[PDB]
Design a protein around this nucleic acid. Structure first.
Lengths: 97, 50, 119, 97, 84
RNA sequence: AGUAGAAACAAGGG
RNA sequence: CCCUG
RNA sequence: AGUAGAAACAAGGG
RNA sequence: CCCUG
């Protein structure tokens, strides 16, 4: 399936200012600012047929990019990931003959 | 409010909040932490010289 | 006014200055992705810019060394806290107006507090 | 005095996410969005020794800038007002000999 | 699919196209400062871009008229309601 | 790698 | 560099 | 205009 | 255009 069904877990917040349709990135950041239990990620169940350090680096990259939002003159509405090697491999870039 | 070294259990969000909360959780005796590391306040009139 | 100057300085990213070996002990990123130090060098020296998050990281994640010597060299200060801990207090007497060290707590404008040090 | 004391009125909202020091412009906008009774301003008690219409133009300009905040690629933290004629006069520009 | 096309189109600033005399009846800004129409002209014609806020502005603030000709023209629909 | 299933995508032309 | 979904 | 009160600000130099 | 609060 595209997403987990029984194993899904969510980080929850409360927004009393009922916005009809607001930017989702701010909501994601706010939900991530209610957790204080982060630690160093490590691989326990690997993907047999894939390069796992690329997945680990991808997670570290999203974590770093989210923090890089604070040191900006103006906050953006959408975040554009950098075309790094691990994202090049994971997203199957330059694979078509 | 100047050095942003709020308490460890206080729910104020800041750049140092994560590190201070982790340090508070690590320790066994929360009364030994410096006020600069999100510890409690122990000073009083009889202690203003130590 | 230095007070407001430091109020503004603490708002920046890396207001502290450190040496270059710091890069070998503490990492560039937190467990959540926050930056701790930057590649830029200080003007006029080879120092580097560091953020207070580095100080907290070192305090909660860093090498440990025995501190047995500290009480010995700072013996005078520790003697004071020992005497204060082991002292005994007394009733307050409101009347017209080892001991001098605590003078700010015993005497007052129009009151007297009984105090005998525990040492 | 620099601000009203007995005649003050405030538009109030709630922020359950206790931010130590956030951007006040967004708080201002969120507080503004809770009022649905605006109308066309007019002058009722004028200033005898000043050019009254400039104040009205300044108020309308501030409203226009607040609405322009929405049409931007990235949301800014501080809003620098355009150096207009009414702001040139109201802030006493080019009056020193 | 036209449905998602208009779902996107309504998300823009000025999806509607109107004539040029509109600039003379409704103002360029609301009582709160919201823009209603833009100076940019339509491509391939002289029409002017307008946001949906202009429609509601017209509905709540605009010229009034007496309508005693619509029902006569739409007699069948009114008869349908009257019978019901 | 992945989607997907009797044949395709994982970009094409100048 | 341009055009195309 | 405004701050302010026995003299000044309401930008200065190249 | 540069410098200075």
């Amino acid at each position: 399936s595209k997403f987990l069904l029984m194993d899904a877990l969510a980080l929850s917040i409360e927004d009393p200012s009922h916005e009809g349709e607001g930017i989702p990135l701010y909501d994601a950041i706010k939900c991530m600012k209610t957790f204080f239990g982060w630690k160093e990620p490590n691989i326990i169940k690997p993907h047999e047929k894939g390069i796992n350090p690329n997945y680990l680096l991808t997670w570290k990259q999203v974590l770093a990019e989210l923090q890089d939002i604070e040191n900006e003159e103006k906050i953006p509405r959408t975040k554009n990931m950098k075309k790094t090697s691990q994202l090049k491999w994971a997203l199957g870039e330059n694979m078509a003959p | 409010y100047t050095y942003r070294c709020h308490r460890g259990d206080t729910q104020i969000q800041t750049r140092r909040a994560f590190e201070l909360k982790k340090l508070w959780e690590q320790t066994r005796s929360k009364a030994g932490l410096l006020v600069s590391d999100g510890g409690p306040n122990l000073y009083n009139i009889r202690n203003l010289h130590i | 006014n230095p007070a407001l100057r430091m109020k503004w300085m603490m708002a920046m990213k890396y207001p502290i200055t450190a040496d270059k070996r710091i890069m070998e002990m503490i990492p560039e990123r937190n467990e959540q992705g926050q930056t701790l130090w930057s590649k830029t060098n200080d003007a006029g020296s080879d120092r580097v810019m560091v953020s207070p998050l580095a100080v907290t990281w070192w305090n909660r994640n860093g090498p440990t060394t025995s501190t047995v010597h500290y009480p010995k060299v700072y013996k005078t200060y520790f003697e004071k806290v020992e005497r204060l801990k082991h002292g005994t207090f007394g009733p307050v007497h409101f009347r017209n107006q080892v001991y001098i060290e605590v003078l700010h707590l015993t005497q007052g404008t129009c009151w007297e507090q009984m105090y005998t040090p525990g040492g």
